[PDB]
Amino acid sequence: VQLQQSGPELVKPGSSVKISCKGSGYTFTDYNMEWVKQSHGKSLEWIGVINPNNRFTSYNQNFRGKATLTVDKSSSTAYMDLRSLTSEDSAVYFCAGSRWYQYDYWGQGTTLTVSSASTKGPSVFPLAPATAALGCLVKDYFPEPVTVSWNSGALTSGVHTFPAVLQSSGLYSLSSVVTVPSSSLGTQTYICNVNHAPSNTKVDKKVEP
Amino acid sequence: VVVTQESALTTSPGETVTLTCRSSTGAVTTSNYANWVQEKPDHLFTGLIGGINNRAPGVPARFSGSLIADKAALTITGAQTEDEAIYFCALWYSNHWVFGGGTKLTVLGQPKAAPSVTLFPPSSEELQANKATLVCLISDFYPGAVTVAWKADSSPVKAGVETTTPSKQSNNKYAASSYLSLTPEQWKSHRSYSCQVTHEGSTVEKTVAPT
Amino acid sequence: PIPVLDENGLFAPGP
Ligand SMILES: [Cl-]
Ligand code: NA
C-alpha cells in the first residue's frame, strides 16, 4: 500500500496550488480520502474528507473557501486545491485513507511554502577540528532540502547530518559533523559535499585543522 | 473545541503505559470514534486504533483503545523499544475530526547517556563574510530530550538562538544542534561564550573565546 | 446533510 503525494511546492501569495494523492496496492474505492494540515511540524488540523464513489464531502468550516476536494476515480487519485494562498498556508499536508471511522493508510506528506522569496543557495563554512569532530556549516538557504555527504559518499561511519533550523529571516541552516581519528588529521582529506537542488547549487568544502 | 493529551510519558520495555485524550466538550463517548495515530521520524504516520476500539490491519496486538472515566485511552500492554514515537488522538464531532497535540512516548530501550557536546566558534571564513555563528553540536544522548541555554560571558543570551528538536543518529542514540547567530562585533565584544546543555537534570557546558 | 456511513463504511449524505 502506497499513498503517493505530489512533490513540494513553492508559490507566491495569492496563487493557488493543487496537491494530488494517488493510491496503489489497495482498492481506491474502498476508502474515503481525508486531508490533514501539519503546522510547525507539530499541530495537526483536519481539513476535510471526500468519498471517491459518490463525491460526498465534509469540510472543516475553517477551510471553506480555502480548500476544495475532488477525485478522479479512474486514476485512483484524490486532489486538494488550496486557493488565495498566504504564508499561513505554509505547512505539510497529508492525505489518509479511511473507512468505518478509522485511518488505515497515510501519505508521506506534501510541503507547501507560500512566500514572495525566490530560491537561495547555501553558503558553506568549515567546522574545523583520540577522536576529533569536524563538520560543515550550511547557512541561509531556501527552500528545503539540503543533502550532505562526505568524501563523495566514501565516508559514512560516524557521520551525522542534522535537521535544519528555520531562522526568523525565513532561511534555513544545518550542519553535518563527522568524528574521525585524530591521528588521520593532517594527512587524510575531509570534504563535505553539499547539495541544494532547489537552487541548482553544489558546494565541496575541504575541512582542514 | 480542544483535544488534550499528555505532552510526554516515559515507560520501560515490557511495562504497561496508558495515554489519554480529553475533550473540552465533556466526556468522550463511543460516538467520538477515538482514533490513535503514531508518528515516527520522517513523517511516517501509522493508524493504530479507530472506529470503536478497533485495531487497524497489521497493528500489533499490544495496542488497544478504551474509555477511562471521561477520556479516551490508548493502552500499550508490554511496550516495545520500537514504540518510542509520538501518539496523536483524534475525536469525531458529528461532521469533523479534531486532533490532540500529541504525546511523546519514551520507551527506555537503550542505556541512558548524557550528551557529548562540541562547540565550534565562528570560522575565520565566515567572519570575513561579516557574520559569526557559534555551532553547538549535541551528540550520543538518551533519552531524547534536552534543554539548551547560551551565555555571553556569564550573561544569558536572549536572542539569536535556534535549536533543533532531537532526532536519531545512525547508532540509534539522539543528537541535536543549537546555533547562536552573532555579528563579528558582538562575537568579539565578550571574553567567552558558553553552550549549556541540560539532560535529565545534569548540565554539560562548553566554552569558546574569540582569542 | 449529516455525514453517515454507508454499507461499505464510507461517508454518504444523511437525512
Ligand atoms: Cl468545523
Ligand atoms: Na495521549
Q: Which residues of B touch A60 (CB under 8 A)?
A: 96
* Method by which the coordinates were obtained: X-ray
- What CA–CA distance (Å, rounded) separates B35 from B3? 12
Strands A9-11 and A110-114, sheet pairing = parallel
Kindly tell me the sign of the dihedral angle through the C-alpha atoms of B20, B21, B27, B33: negative
- Considering only CA atoms, give the Rg of chain A: 21
CATH superfamily of A2-114: Immunoglobulins (2.60.40.10)
Cell matching residue A169: 529571516
Contact predicate A150/A46, CB 8 Å: no
Q: Which of B51, B59, B112 is nearest to B83 (CA)?
A: B59
Q: Does C2 touch chain B (CB under 8 A)?
A: yes
Same fold, A2-114 and A123-206: yes
Contact predicate B50/B74, CB 8 Å: no
Cα B172 vs. chain centroid, distance in angstroms?
A: 15
- Would you list the DSSP string of B143-182? SS--EEEEEETTEEP-SSEEEPPPEE-TTS-EEEEEEEEE
CATH for A123-206, options being 3.40.30.10, 2.60.40.3680, 3.30.930.10, 2.60.40.10: 2.60.40.10
CATH architecture of B3-107: Sandwich (2.60)
- What CA–CA distance (Å, rounded) separates A94 from A109? 5
- What CA–CA distance (Å, rounded) separates A159 from B145? 21
Name residue B112's amino acid: K
- What CA–CA distance (Å, rounded) separates B206 from B161? 16
Tell me the three state secondary structure of residue B209. coil
Strands B193-199 and B147-152, sheet pairing = antiparallel
Q: How close is the Cα of A188 to the center of ligand 1, in Å?
A: 61
Q: Which ligand is nearest to the CA of B21?
A: 2
Q: Which of A75, A23, A66, A29 is nearest to A50 (CA)?
A: A29
What H or E segment, with its residue span, contains residue B200?
A: none
- Would you list the DSSP string of chain A? -EEEE---EEE-TT--EEEEEEEESS-GGGSEEEEEEEETTTEEEEEEEE-TTT--EEE-GGGTTTEEEEEEGGGTEEEEEE-S--GGG-EEEEEEEEETTEEEEE---EEEEE-SPPPBPPEEEEE---EEEEEEEEEEEBSS--EEEEGGGTB-TTEEEPPPEE-TTS-EEEEEEEEEEGGGBTTB--EEEEEEGGGTEEEEEE---
Q: Which residues of C touch A49 (CB under 8 A)?
A: 3, 11
- What CA–CA distance (Å, rounded) separates B107 from B85? 9
Q: How close is the Cα of B88 to the center of ligand 2, in Å?
A: 7
Cα B154 vs. chain centroid, distance in angstroms?
A: 28
Task: Among B44, B137, B195, pick the best mutation site for testing chain A contact (most A Cβ within 10 A).
Answer: B137
Residue boundaries of the structural domains of chain A: 2-114, 123-206
| CATH code for the structural domain at B116-208 | 2.60.40.10
Contact predicate A119/A199, CB 8 Å: yes
Q: Which residues of B touch A104 (CB under 8 A)?
A: 47, 56-57
Burial class from Cβ neighbours inside 10 Å (0-12, 13-18, 19+) for residue B202 reads: exposed
Q: Which ligand is nearest to the CA of A64?
A: 1
Q: Which of B206, B209, B162, B160 is nearest to B188 (CA)?
A: B209
- What CA–CA distance (Å, rounded) separates A128 from B208? 13
Phi, psi of A81 (to 5 degrees): -105, 125
User: CATH 2.60.40.10 occupies which residues in chain B?
Assistant: 3-107, 116-208
- What CA–CA distance (Å, rounded) separates B38 from B19? 12
Lateral strand order in the sheet of B155-156: B155-156, B147-152, B193-199, B202-208
Task: Among A33, A57, A98, A99, pick the best mutation site for testing chain C contact (most C Cβ within 10 A).
Answer: A99
Q: Does C8 touch chain A (CB under 8 A)?
A: yes
Cα A89 vs. chain centroid, distance in angstroms?
A: 15
Of A42, A58, A102, the CB nearest to B35: A102
Q: What is the resolution of this structure in A?
A: 1.6
- What CA–CA distance (Å, rounded) separates A208 from A191? 9
Q: Which of A199, A198, A135, A144 is nearest to A172 (CA)?
A: A144
Is the previous residue joined to B143 through a cis bond, with omega within 30 degrees of 0?
Answer: yes
